[PDB]
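Q: A reviewer asked whether we had any structural model of the full assembly, not just the individual parts. We don't, so I'm hoping you can provide one. Inputs are below.
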Amino acid sequence: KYIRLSTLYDLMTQHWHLKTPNLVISVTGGAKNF
Amino acid sequence: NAISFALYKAFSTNEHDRDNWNGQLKLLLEWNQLDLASDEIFTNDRNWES
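A: Here is a predicted structure for the entire assembly that you could use as a starting point for your response.
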């Protein structure tokens, strides 16, 4: 599901799927070598 | 583990193999240096493309 970007929560947590009782973030960035 | 560790040091300090990192890999592949190649070649601060 592409969305171009330049609030977000309403159309994506009521019309799409469930809530999120945890939220992990992996910060790597576009490093092609890992 | 002593010859290849010594031969790599005289190769690495020529200051012309930063672009020629591919020479240091075939050197460490001609010998068997896993721990040296995984720490000093494949350590992501150098720019390779895989």
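A: Points you may want to mention in the reply: The first helix of chain B runs from residue 3 to 12. The two ends of chain B are 26 Å apart (CA to CA).
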